[PDB]
């Protein structure tokens, strides 16, 4: 019965500021984002391979809708419009490759995985730098 669906509570965050730095976010905006990202609300709805994911903070909210295997548009973690495509790497792990709509920048991606223990891992990557965030349902 359990899947990616849930209201998810963060329990661990690593390397978020480093990710924003590689993306070229300046010091003062990074400080704002890091603080706000420390207590996000995350809502996922899954129906088969169709997903809704809303990630909210006091300073910024993202809401994405996608089907695995079908291109969609969203934003990079630093706010730049991109084309995205999610695939199943494995049964419990989706991987999203991103391409900017305009300009150039680090190669970005994200992954979401349901681990053996019932928890969710999000990773966000820019070039070689990875941010890892772990959640449990509320
Ligand atoms: C200054 C501020 C408004 N600002 C401008 C710069 C920038 C776009 C980088 C930015 C990013 C965020 C974020 C985030 C976040 C990402 C993932 C999660 C998660 O999945 O848990 C939670 C939060 C917040 C503020 C913010």
- Does 52 show up as a binding residue in the annotation? no
| Token couple for 111 | 């992954």
Where residue 69 sits, what CATH number does that domain have? Answer: 2.40.128.20
Q: What's the number of domains the chain is made of?
A: 1
Please answer whether residues 123 and 132 qualify as being in contact, where contact means their C-beta atoms are separated by less than 8 angstroms. yes
- Does 60 show up as a binding residue in the annotation? no
- Contacts for 84-90: CB closer than 8 Å, 24+ residues apart: 86/51
Give the Cα separation of 98 and 105 in Å (integer). 11
- SS3 of the chain: the string is CCCCCEEEEEEEEECHHHHHHHCCCCHHHHHHHHHHHCCCEEEEEEECCEEEEEEECCCCEEEEEEECCCCEEEECCCCCEEEEEEEEEECCEEEEEEEECCCCCCCEEEEEEECCCCCEEEEEEECCEEEEEEEEEC
Answer yes or no: is the C-beta of 60 below 6 A from any ligand 1 atom. Answer: yes
Range of the structural domain that residue 2 is part of: 1-138
Give the Cα separation of 16 and 105 in Å (integer). 17
Structural method: X-ray
12: which strand partners?
Answer: 134
What's this structure's resolution in Å?
1.5
Question: What is the phi/psi pair of residue 18, to 5°?
Answer: -60, -40
24, 57, 125: residue to mutate for ligand 1 pocket, most atoms within 8 A of CB = 57
């Amino acid at each position: 019965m359990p899947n990616f669906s849930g209201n998810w509570k963060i329990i661990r965050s690593e390397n978020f500021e480093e990710l924003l730095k590689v993306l070229g976010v300046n010091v003062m905006l990074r400080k704002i984002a890091v603080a706000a990202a420390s207590k996000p609300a995350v809502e996922i709805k899954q129906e088969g391979d169709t997903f809704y994911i809303k990630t909210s903070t006091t300073v910024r909210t993202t809401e994405i809708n996608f089907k695995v295997g079908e291109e969609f548009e969203e934003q990079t973690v630093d706010g730049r419009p991109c084309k995205s495509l999610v695939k199943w790497e494995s049964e419990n792990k989706m991987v999203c490759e991103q391409k900017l709509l305009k300009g150039e920048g680090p190669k970005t991606s994200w992954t979401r995985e349901l681990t053996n223990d019932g928890e969710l891992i999000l990773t966000m990557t820019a070039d070689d730098v990875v941010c890892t965030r772990v959640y449990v349902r509320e």
